């Protein structure tokens, strides 16, 4: 994928913003990288919300390793194009730059695609209520004295 | 009472902490160079010597590592890393971000005053210290005094 | 998390506003940091409303320890990305600046996600009224002389 | 043994912390005054200089301001403060209490025998210890001695 | 414009982490020896700002900040001989060991230097000539251009 490391995400976001790339002759300054990776960790910690949020493969650094830029991230190949686009949309307030509308639309699309699979997987129907008889057609649960549904428990 | 005072209890190890915050530089690097120059390039760097527990010096490479506590680590915590002259300090962070840069720094070593005192003063054994004259002359070097 | 202390939130807000960060030549005077910390404490006390408002892990300075900027904040990792964004939004009138629209949207999202879990947890249904009979199908509460529901009490 | 090596590599920026807990004093005033005197009184204060890169010493107001990092700060930036040695130090918190008070900073010196010893002897370099003549002559005060090498 | 302003108070921190060694213990022993055993140590003394000295029990304690404290106030501790210190945490682990805080022994070396050096004094350290001559023996220097009256 060639975007294995968090530093790759930061560099891609900066290049998208036009701050530091090779298409523009400027280079990345380390403190910008540190600020961007801190902001990326903060943003990613808000989306997951301990599980009740957007579920994506991501490893949060325990800070045992001091340099958090070089370590790997567990993002699946489909979420990368959303994560760094959202990161680039968020970073621009740090400078006076404003993100282009294309980046905003791409971030919207990426987040929607991120959450759609979990939305499909989490749409489950509730069981039968406790006071609902099972009709005389079952003929086995009816013979086992188990006339009524157990309930939501 | 008022007994003589010679040495005070003190901490002999320095801590390097990040400016603008109260955190310790995790695994930064310290570059030591000449007075008003850039310590990064090889030309401006100056020799750096360890000071062991016993009087001895071992030279090491210029970039100095820092552990999580903020003290220079080497393998185990290293003692006083004494250099010569007045150097310029250029502390970098873990990911190559400049923490602080200072031009002129000079702090003298408080240890080993015996060697400096021996190299400083001149010898006069006197006579009151010794009972007789022969033993006084035996230990007399480049001078002698009478009662 | 690298934002353990309150001063870390203040510095993150200042960086997001662009006033001062690590890579800037000029810096703000410590009285400005003290004023920002006081404003942050005021903001967090107004949301709590004494347990009846937004509930998040937060410890208020007891004033016995002099520097309230240095002590740690009990915020969980998910609320950090909202607290300093809101603090930066409130700090803009302190200077001559005005907060960027992206920061406003991020603060809105952060507060909504802060309150959604408490809103879910506080949506409870009241018990049966006092004058509500229990039907003849219970067969145990009916035989225990307890024909009617107790009430809200 | 290898060389004189009289200079120690240490922290070049001082750090001030609280007394009751472990956290840097924020917005805490620092006062500097004469020996065994109260620096709070403006009559007892001594000039305090900022040493720029150029070497020019610029005097500033007596109450020094600390930042959240625990280091002396002028107008938001870290500075190097140099004063005449022998100054009492009084650190005050932002609230207005007293953190520390030191009558003589020279007393908090790991080696105090050297101060007493320096007064009551004569300084004269011996030629034996130094390798060459010029090195001995340069560091020579109040006469020399002529020996081997 | 000579000495940089710095905090001379000692702060004791852990070797492998940024902590304050809360409620630690410092043992001041004899030169190049282990001070844990109770037989092999030297007396320690408090030095107040005025100059009085008080005898102190061996197991020096550390405050929460990381500074030595006696009763409820920060103190300064002075010993007469050279000493080796050993800092321990609350759990009994070893934080740091220094065989020689000073490489030489102040007392024996002081006696030796008294034996083998001349006792002449200079005027530079003493404000007035009479004060200098009062405590001067075996010689005097007239260093500075002393004014007659």
Description of the molecule:
- The structure is cut from a larger assembly and holds 2 copies of chain A (153 residues) and 3 copies of chain B.
- Chain A is built from 4 helices and no strands.
- Chain A is mainly alpha-helical and 153 residues long.
- In chain A, helix 1 packs across helix 3 and helix 2 crosses helix 3.
- Chain A is elongated.
- Helices cover 9% and strands 16% of the residues of chain B.
- The longest helix of chain B has 8 residues.
- Chain B is elongated.
- The two termini of chain B are 32 Å apart.
- Chains B and D meet through strand 1, strand 5 and helix 1 of B and helix 1 and strand 10 of D.
- It is classed as viral protein.
| Beta strand count of chain B | 5
Question: What would you call the shape of chain B?
Answer: elongated
Q: Give me the side-by-side strand order of the main sheet of chain B.
A: 3-2-4-5
How many runs of DSSP E, i.e. beta strands of chain A? 0
Class of secondary structure makeup of chain B: mainly beta
Shape estimate of chain A: elongated
- Computed over alpha carbons, the radius of gyration of chain A is 24 Å
Strand content of chain B: 15-25%
Beta strand % of chain A: under 5%
Number of helices of chain A: 4
Quick one: biggest sheet of chain B? 4 strands, antiparallel
Q: Biggest interface: chains and residue counts?
A: B-D, 55 and 43 residues
Residue share in helices of chain A?
Answer: 40-55%
Fraction of residues in H or I helices of chain B:
under 10%
How are helices and strands ordered from N to C of chain A?
HHHH
- N-to-C order of helices and strands of chain B: EEEEEHH
Organism (chain B): Salmonella typhimurium
Domain Bacteriophage P22 tailspike N-terminal (chain B): 1-112
Protein name (chain B): Endorhamnosidase
Protein name (chains A, C): P22 tail accessory factor
